[PDB]
Amino acid sequence: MSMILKEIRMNNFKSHVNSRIKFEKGIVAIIGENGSGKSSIFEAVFFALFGAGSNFNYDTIITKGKKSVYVELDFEVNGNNYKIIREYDSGRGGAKLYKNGKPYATTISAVNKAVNEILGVDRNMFLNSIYIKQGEIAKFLSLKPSEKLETVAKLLGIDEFEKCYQKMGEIVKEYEKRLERIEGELNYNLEKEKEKLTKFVEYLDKVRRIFGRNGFQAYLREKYVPLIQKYLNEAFSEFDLPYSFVELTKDFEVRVHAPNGVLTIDNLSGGEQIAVALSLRLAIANALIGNRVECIILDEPTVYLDENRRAKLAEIFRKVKSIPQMIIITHHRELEDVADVIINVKKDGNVSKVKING
Amino acid sequence: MSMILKEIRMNNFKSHVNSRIKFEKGIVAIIGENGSGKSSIFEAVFFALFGAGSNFNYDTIITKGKKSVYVELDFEVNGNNYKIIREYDSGRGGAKLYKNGKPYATTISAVNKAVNEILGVDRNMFLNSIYIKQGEIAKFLSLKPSEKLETVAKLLGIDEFEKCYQKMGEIVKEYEKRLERIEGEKEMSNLEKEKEKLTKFVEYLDKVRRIFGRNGFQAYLREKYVPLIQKYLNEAFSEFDLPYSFVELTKDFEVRVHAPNGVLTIDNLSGGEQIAVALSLRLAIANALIGNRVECIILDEPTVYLDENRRAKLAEIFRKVKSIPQMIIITHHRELEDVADVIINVKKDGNVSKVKING
Amino acid sequence: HMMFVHIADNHLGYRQYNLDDREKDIYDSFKLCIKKILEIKPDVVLHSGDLFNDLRPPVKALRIAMQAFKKLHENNIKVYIVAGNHEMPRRLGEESPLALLKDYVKILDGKDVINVNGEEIFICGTYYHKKSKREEMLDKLKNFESEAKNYKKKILMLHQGINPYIPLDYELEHFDLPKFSYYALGHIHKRILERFNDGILAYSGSTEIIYRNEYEDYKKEGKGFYLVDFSGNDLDISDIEKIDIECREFVEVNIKDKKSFNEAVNKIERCKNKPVVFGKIKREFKPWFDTLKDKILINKAIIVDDNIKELLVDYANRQGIDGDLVLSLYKALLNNENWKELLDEYYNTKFR
Amino acid sequence: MMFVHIADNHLGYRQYNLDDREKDIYDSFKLCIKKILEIKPDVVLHSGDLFNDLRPPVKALRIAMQAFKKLHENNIKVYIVAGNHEMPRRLGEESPLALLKDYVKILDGKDVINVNGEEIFICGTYYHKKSKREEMLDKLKNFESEAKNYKKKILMLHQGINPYIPLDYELEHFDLPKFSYYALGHIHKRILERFNDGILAYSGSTEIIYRNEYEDYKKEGKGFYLVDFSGNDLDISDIEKIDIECREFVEVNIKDKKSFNEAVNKIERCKNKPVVFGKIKREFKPWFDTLKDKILINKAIIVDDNIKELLVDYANRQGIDGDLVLSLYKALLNNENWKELLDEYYNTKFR
DNA sequence: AAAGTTGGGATTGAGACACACATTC
DNA sequence: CGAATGTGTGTCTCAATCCCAAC
Ligand SMILES: Nc1ncnc2c1ncn2[C@@H]1O[C@H](COP(=O)(O)OP(=O)(O)OP(O)(O)=S)[C@@H](O)[C@H]1O
Ligand SMILES: Nc1ncnc2c1ncn2[C@@H]1O[C@H](COP(=O)(O)OP(=O)(O)OP(O)(O)=S)[C@@H](O)[C@H]1O
Ligand SMILES: [Mg+2]
Ligand SMILES: [Mg+2]
Ligand SMILES: [Mg+2]
Ligand SMILES: [Mg+2]
Structure with a gap:
């Protein structure tokens, strides 16, 4: 995930009748009053990557007076320049996806199909990794045990080995039919060459088992835990919290060590939960500091944190060099003073207006 | 319903090894660090009223080092002074319930069953009416349709009729047992009068039981409650200086907001505007039943998701509120300390929480 | 043969409607109050609380307030102040904004006597006491009572609410006030001036319209400060001239008919500064009223359907x-x- | 003809959410003012980051105000440039330094001073972020044109120069025009070396802010500079470093039984009651509690085995x-x- | 007598599935 | 336009957990 956004344009999308917003590399801070169009900008980006669902109603995203919606999105990933365009005129919708000038997909489903393979992330797992909504900062922590390690695989980069393991089943099976061409006929010296291909297909399965879940994925994930646990403590201690050290199990369940006992995230306060969820998400980023240079989007993370913890969190974000571009929404001033680019958003007549500052 | 809290003591309860906290009438503000011990004070209030549940593990609520837990709570409701004492020594638990001094219940389940008789609210709806936790200020409005009017009835004092509807089920079904007691049973025939006398009476009792039902008079009384709430809802909502015509409240208590060129629902609003509607609605409900259910209300960090401006304007709202006798508020924000009546400061020395109250 | 100025409730930093224009209107009116005070050359200025609006006001409001009382102190005007409810520190180690004015203003929490043109006048005051610690306030008032009997001229500075004036949130009664020649009070923005206990009790109204319930008072009795002449042995209303400052005009309209629409335009034009309109206007009347969003500051009016x-x-x-x-x-x-x-x-x- | 170069006081910084660490910043700052007044220098050059935030506490504003009032009353001209923590981020709000306008010259341009019959050129500007470097270079090139006439010239900047701070540098070294002295800030490492026939200097912080700076305080004391610009030129010889007293820190990595002996003899052989940090083996903590009164706080980790x-x-x-x-x-x-x-x-x- | 042992009760999480709502070919 | 879709919702379930009382 060498993910980075460039710019977005949006017409009649919720409160934004028309707005073009430029993104920059670094700590981009979007500030405004409540209901001023802050969260509405990221609902538009999510709309560009993944079309409207039943959960993403058009009547919900159309400007209540208007009857159409248009949005185009520029971004880079692994070096290529992409351009997604989505519209809904008067009942019909269309979508275009350009790759370095020339188009790549021309239908809505074709764009959705193209997005999920370029990102390697689907609609649902995109909300647990890149786009973290309000209060759902700890949602990644409390996920189901299967879902927790499922979204961890994408967060650590291991999920690309599962793409080989499934493409190996295509490879193993096809070399098996070249063996069926001898096996399906050897019934009803150079016999040694018959055994040369049989021992060769058997080799592929044990190679498929290497890329498998229990093979190298678990092995690499097991070797990743102490590193994340080290970075988790480095960032969590910045909150000057009174706890010995934060233990991270291999199942990515978090345990906090108190002096006279051991506590879990259930017992931790609303703010202490956020203190762990952020520092863990940064520990994952700091773990693969150069392997997976992913961008991060946050919607009001300093909520539930007191005056001091909001301040300390800013100094944490400033020393973070592992994430190239992290866009943060806040109604708090503790993050204006640490950002490089501050995007101010106000509202006039139910219509939002964007003012970019360099 | 004249419910007001008084004071609470607690031993080895989570971070509080020992703490005695007195409450006063007015705008009570609980301040402290993150993890200082603010919410734990109300985890104890909930512990005294209703015993530990399976999810409310003792290992969850005992001080992780200690082995015992003690909590005694004083409070008032409809004018009487009550005192609850719950303990758990080293494996054994007990509960005491006093009324104006002398004891009423001595076993845990005896206290548990008794508390639910004086409040009229069980475990589930006490967290939706009186003790509103984090973020759930607005959850009640986006809730599931049946669950929404289920909790609307409790904060409206309508649930007092559902208790009749189910306790009426006792009478209808027990007066039917008085027919089977008769059915199985030169002198004869003065019981033909009893066939028409009791059967037409049981059909009457069930015909009365439908009056106390939800769709009978509860929904009817709820309909006659909406117009008053809708006006108060807008009077308090306009204090947030938000750009909308007026706030419409349906009979089913799902909210529609009137924009100039459109109409929006809570699904579309931003998080902070949901909280704005939620607090203004609960204050409108409170302003409605000024004497019917003059209950106390507890809020855990409501100004979260609100910007600097809404936090201030919300503070000027709470000062004009006279319908709620005692509203205790927790905040990590300074926007509410300056408007409170009593400021209960809560600090933590490492892992033990210590309270410094200023009157 | 002396004169002093009684001013209160400036609420520097109040950002009404989160609007920049309304924030500066508080600074300007305060600057102009200082301007008029400098023109008068009064011997003493009695500020009876609520100079700032918050305990953590903006740096701009701190600068504006400082440069004002520095002007007053350099011109040999002794300024006395008592902390208001918006200025009493809520936490311990942090300080009140008034501490920046220590070298230009005497923050009153006790007694003080001054010689002005050959006569001793007794000044005393205390900070804002919340309704809980009234007995501590009463203990301060009975102490200020004993230390004053020697002086025939005496003044009391308080930032409280007295019962017969605000029934909503009053913290003291009338009979708790000992006899003084003058009462320089605050915390209510309705300007009040009346006789009391063989003396003069006075509430210096606010300087700019803060809460919207206070234009009802602004048009009857203008907002500003008091100028008191304590030349005679006693005090009356005759030797008290109220000096009014100009505030932002507010225009209330109930345009639901065309007969109520001429009431708008003719008033919006016949007022001093760019006014603020509020109330209810029928939606079929609103767009033809939107033509005047240039001759107005802001429009806080409701658009009603039918x-x-x-x-x-x-x-x-x-x-x-x-x-x-x-x-x-x-x-x-x-x-x-x-x-x-x-x-x-x-x-x-x-x-x- | 002597001046003082001081920077990075970070007034209002509340380290560890602890009251004592907030006051420790005030005292060292008050003590810096005290020593400066004891010296009576002709000019004081404050090169940024006086406050820690844009909206500091009322106490920190009073402490700073009454401090710079004393310097102005003693006929000491103080020049300051706005730091990165002092540049206003929003529209209508002001920098905290605006309260000091009548006692301190906030530098965004040029100024000349007469000191016992000699013209000395002072110039400086606020913190320019790395994005607006091209505007900064035009401000530096203007300060070059207005300086060729004066043989004595000083430049006040609150930036990071490339060969000194590689992480967050906003200017390179070759963009700096020739000056006799460079009064810089924004890095808390105390730096002093020659640069372009002159002396480039970072006065450094006044108190230990970020934990990477007690290793410096034991090696390089924290405080301000006292420069003697009496002669026509400047060298390293005529610059005396003034050290201030800070909060002691004690670093321990207790994983052995010999690492408990290092503590008591070090905790007592320091000036004030120190702050301990690092790792302490779990088996050593209860026998370590005996001296938690001769220490301030213990931000040390309890490690199992x-x-x-x-x-x-x-x-x-x-x-x-x-x-x-x-x-x-x-x-x-x-x-x-x-x-x-x-x-x-x-x-x-x-x- | 004392100690665990034990079943009654309440709530919770994960796993199934028809019933919708809306997008999209 | 009707079918193919994922998306959410309501509700139902077996199963576990742990408090509470009892022998
Ligand atoms: N279909 C729509 N037409 C017009 N306005 C809409 C529509 N849907 C939502 N809105 C408005 O868009 C605003 C929501 O924008 P948000 O970005 O969520 O606000 P916000 O500033 O981000 O506050 P947060 O961050 O969510 S707490 C609200 O004022 C809604 O009333
Ligand atoms: N069983 C326990 N033993 C000891 N400490 C505990 C236990 N359970 C929780 N804690 C700690 O007790 C503290 C109390 O925090 P809370 O109860 O959430 O109060 P609070 O943080 O002040 O209020 P909010 O609303 O949560 S920010 C936290 O730091 C927990 O980690
Ligand atoms: Mg007041
Ligand atoms: Mg006032
Ligand atoms: Mg700096
Ligand atoms: Mg610095």
Whole structure:
């Protein structure tokens, strides 16, 4: 995930009748009053990557007076320049996806199909990794045990080995039919060459088992835990919290060590939960500091944190060099003073207006 | 319903090894660090009223080092002074319930069953009416349709009729047992009068039981409650200086907001505007039943998701509120300390929480 | 042969409607109050609280307030102040904004006597006491009472609410006030001036319109400060001239007809500064009123489109059932009284 | 003709959410003012980061105000440039330094001073972020044109220069025009060396802010500079470093039984009651509690007791050719012809 | 007598599935 | 336009957990 956004344009999308917003590399801070169009900008980006669902109603995203919606999105990933365009005129919708000038997909489903393979992330797992909504900062922590390690695989980069393991089943099976061409006929010296291909297909399965879940994925994930646990403590201690050290199990369940006992995230306060969820998400980023240079989007993370913890969190974000571009929404001033680019958003007549500052 | 809290003591309860906290009438503000011990004070209030549940593990609520837990709570409701004492020594638990001094219940389940008789609210709806936790200020409005009017009835004092509807089920079904007691049973025939006398009476009792039902008079009384709430809802909502015509409240208590060129629902609003509607609605409900259910209300960090401006304007709202006798508020924000009546400061020395109250 | 200025409730930093223009209007009116004070050359300035609006006001409001009282101190005007409710520190180690004015203003928490043109006048005051610590306030007032009997001229500075003036949130009664020649009070933005205990009790109104319920008072009695002449041995209303400052005009309109629309335009044009309109206007009238969003500051007007005990019986009888039974049974079950003893009476006696 | 170069006071910084650490910043700042007043220098050059935030506490504003009032009353001209924590971020709000306007010259341009019959050129500007460097270079080139007449000239900047702070530098070294002295800030490492026939200097912080700076305080004391610009030129000789007293820190990494002996003799052989940090083995903590009164606080931990290379390492451990696993891992993920690559392996290098 | 042992009760999480709502070919 | 879709919702379930009382 060498993910980075460039710019977005949006017409009649919720409160934004028309707005073009430029993104920059670094700590981009979007500030405004409540209901001023802050969260509405990221609902538009999510709309560009993944079309409207039943959960993403058009009547919900159309400007209540208007009857159409248009949005185009520029971004880079692994070096290529992409351009997604989505519209809904008067009942019909269309979508275009350009790759370095020339188009790549021309239908809505074709764009959705193209997005999920370029990102390697689907609609649902995109909300647990890149786009973290309000209060759902700890949602990644409390996920189901299967879902927790499922979204961890994408967060650590291991999920690309599962793409080989499934493409190996295509490879193993096809070399098996070249063996069926001898096996399906050897019934009803150079016999040694018959055994040369049989021992060769058997080799592929044990190679498929290497890329498998229990093979190298678990092995690499097991070797990743102490590193994340080290970075988790480095960032969590910045909150000057009174706890010995934060233990991270291999199942990515978090345990906090108190002096006279051991506590879990259930017992931790609303703010202490956020203190762990952020520092863990940064520990994952700091773990693969150069392997997976992913961008991060946050919607009001300093909520539930007191005056001091909001301040300390800013100094944490400033020393973070592992994430190239992290866009943060806040109604708090503790993050204006640490950002490089501050995007101010106000509202006039139910219509939002964007003012970019360099 | 004249419910007001008084004071609470607690031993080895989570971070509080020992703490005695007195409450006063007015705008009570609980301040402290993150993890200082603010919410734990109300985890104890909930512990005294209703015993530990399976999810409310003792290992969850005992001080992780200690082995015992003690909590005694004083409070008032409809004018009487009550005192609850719950303990758990080293494996054994007990509960005491006093009324104006002398004891009423001595076993845990005896206290548990008794508390639910004086409040009229069980475990589930006490967290939706009186003790509103984090973020759930607005959850009640986006809730599931049946669950929404289920909790609307409790904060409206309508649930007092559902208790009749189910306790009426006792009478209808027990007066039917008085027919089977008769059915199985030169002198004869003065019981033909009893066939028409009791059967037409049981059909009457069930015909009365439908009056106390939800769709009978509860929904009817709820309909006659909406117009008053809708006006108060807008009077308090306009204090947030938000750009909308007026706030419409349906009979089913799902909210529609009137924009100039459109109409929006809570699904579309931003998080902070949901909280704005939620607090203004609960204050409108409170302003409605000024004497019917003059209950106390507890809020855990409501100004979260609100910007600097809404936090201030919300503070000027709470000062004009006279319908709620005692509203205790927790905040990590300074926007509410300056408007409170009593400021209960809560600090933590490492892992033990210590309270410094200023009157 | 002396004069002093009584001013209060400036609320520097108040950002009404989160609007920049309304924030500066507080600074300007405060600057102009300082401007007029400098023109008068008064001997003493008595500021009776609520100079700032918050405990953590903006740096701009701190600069504006500082440079004002520095002007007053350099011109040999001694300024006395008492902390208001918006200025009393809520936490311990942090300081009040008034501490920046220590070298230009005497923050009153006790007594002080001054010689002005050959006469001793007794000044005393204390900070804002919340309604809980009234007995501590009363203990301060009885102390200020004993230390004053020697002086025939005495003044008391308080930032509280007195009972006969604000019934909503008053913290002291009238009989708790000892006899003083003058009462320089605050915290209510309605300008009040009346006789009291063989003296003069006075509430210096606010300087700019803060809460919207205070334009009702602004048009009757203008906002500004008091100028008191304590030349005679005693004090009356004759030697007190109120000096009014100019505030932001507010225009209330109820345009739901065309007869109420001429009331708008002719008033919006016949007012001093760019006014603020509020109220309700029919949506079919609003867009032809939007033509004046250039001659107005902001538009806070609404766009408009176009007990149980009695009802339960009324409902039960309407369904065809004895409500008297429904009600008396409704009370029988809520208490732990015998429903059987109450129902068996109905089934025997009053049934059909 | 002497002046003082001081910077990075960070007034209002509340380290560890602790009251004592907030006051420790005030005292050292008050003590810096005290020593400066004791010296009576002709000019004081404050080169940024006086406050820690844009909206500091009322106490920190009073402490700073009454401090710079004393310096102005003693006929000491103080010049300041706005720091990165002092540049207003929003529209209508002001910098905290605006309260000091009548006692301190906030530098955004040029100024000349007469000191016992000699013209000395002072110039400076606020913190320019790395984005607006091109505007900064035009401000520096203007300060160069207005300076060629004066043989004595000083430059006040609150930036980071490339060869000194590589992480967050906003200017390179060759963009700096010739000046006799460079009064810089924004890095808390106390730096002093020659640069372009002059002296480039970072006065450094006044109190230990970030934890990487007690290693300095034991080596390089924290405080301000006292420069003697009496002669025509400037060297390292005529610059005296003034050290201030800070809060002591004690670092321990207790994983052994010999690492408990290092504590008491160090905790007492320091000036004030120190702050301990690091790691302490769990078996040592209860016998460590005896001296928690002779310490301030203990932020110490209680301790109990490259994929491409690792994939091949894993395959060989299972008994499989890792170079094959890797080259295949690339063939399908890059969507290359695994068909063309697999057919080769079975023929030549199989068993 | 004392100690665990034990079943009654309440709530919770994960796993199934028809019933919708809306997008999209 | 009707079917193919994922998306959410309501509700139902077996199963576990742990408090509470009892022998
Ligand atoms: N279909 C729509 N037409 C017009 N306005 C809409 C529509 N849907 C939502 N809105 C408005 O868009 C605003 C929501 O924008 P948000 O970005 O969520 O606000 P916000 O500033 O981000 O506050 P947060 O960050 O969510 S707490 C609200 O004022 C809604 O009333
Ligand atoms: N069983 C326990 N033993 C000891 N400490 C505990 C236990 N359970 C929780 N804690 C700690 O007790 C503290 C109390 O925090 P809370 O109860 O959430 O109060 P609070 O943080 O002040 O209020 P909010 O609303 O949560 S921010 C936290 O730091 C927990 O980690
Ligand atoms: Mg006041
Ligand atoms: Mg006032
Ligand atoms: Mg700096
Ligand atoms: Mg600095």
